[PDB]
């Protein structure tokens, strides 16, 4: 009636193939803003593209942040300023996504599978914001992360199989939150192991369509547990 959502989606897929994720994200942002619930394909496109786009800035933030600490005065300032450029781009990305999540995506999610997917993502992007938060803003950002993950965690425990990839991705990311952000290794390992153990206990009844994805996360869950102990 005013714009074209199906063409935005095609353009997201074409941006994807062309490996132009910033372009990609902007299509999926525009598509989410049309207000209609996102099919499983669109959902992935949204996630993949904001993942790539933020993931480059995070990666970059680290490399430049480590060089800042490992240093005399003037090259340390240059790194400090380049770091800050990078955080601003990072924050703008997180802010765009969190807004789509809270405004359009989460409240219009009708199935429990999607409500958990989006709440997980909510916590993910709050988490990314906490990885670069300055002192005074850090606390409240961390809390926003935790509440989102918590509310996702509980819906999955009541409504999903413990072998389900999204439940397991939630479990993984939530444990990593506790470990890397809250510096709480006992809650971390416990959450990981419990969610690992419960998955193996239904590894028999594992579907083709949801097998590669579950196993992979189970592996990651383990590698993490290994590293953390």
């Amino acid at each position: 009636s005013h714009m074209d959502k199906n063409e935005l989606v095609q353009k997201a897929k074409l941006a994807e193939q062309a490996e132009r994720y910033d372009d990609m994200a902007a299509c999926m942002k525009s598509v989410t803003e049309q207000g209609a619930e996102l099919s499983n394909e669109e959902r992935n496109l949204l996630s993949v593209a904001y993942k790539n786009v933020v993931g480059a800035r995070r990666s970059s933030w680290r490399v430049v942040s480590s060089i800042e600490q490992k240093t005399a005065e003037k090259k340390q300032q240059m790194a400090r300023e380049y770091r800050e450029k990078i955080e601003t781009e990072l924050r703008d990305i997180c802010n765009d996504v969190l807004s789509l999540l809270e405004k359009f995506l989460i409240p219009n999610a009708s199935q429990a599978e999607s409500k958990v997917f989006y709440l997980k993502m909510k916590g993910d992007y709050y988490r990314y914001l906490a990885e670069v938060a300055a002192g005074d803003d850090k606390k409240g950002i961390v809390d926003q992360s935790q509440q989102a993950y918590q509310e996702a965690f509980e819906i999955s425990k009541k409504e999903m199989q413990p072998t389900h990839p999204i439940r397991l991705g939630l479990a993984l990311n939530f444990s990593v939150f506790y470990y890397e952000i809250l510096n709480s290794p006992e809650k971390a390992c416990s959450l990981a192991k419990t969610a690992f153990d419960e998955a193996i206990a239904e590894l028999d009844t594992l579907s083709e369509e949801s097998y590669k994805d579950s196993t992979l996360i189970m592996q990651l869950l383990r590698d993490n547990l290994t590293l953390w102990t």
């Binding site: 993910d124 939630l170 990311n173 470990y179 990651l220 590698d223 953390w228």
Partner: peptide
């Protein structure tokens, strides 16, 4: 660092 879920 720790590992997180992939898209």
């Amino acid at each position: 660092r720790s590992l997180s879920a992939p898209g």
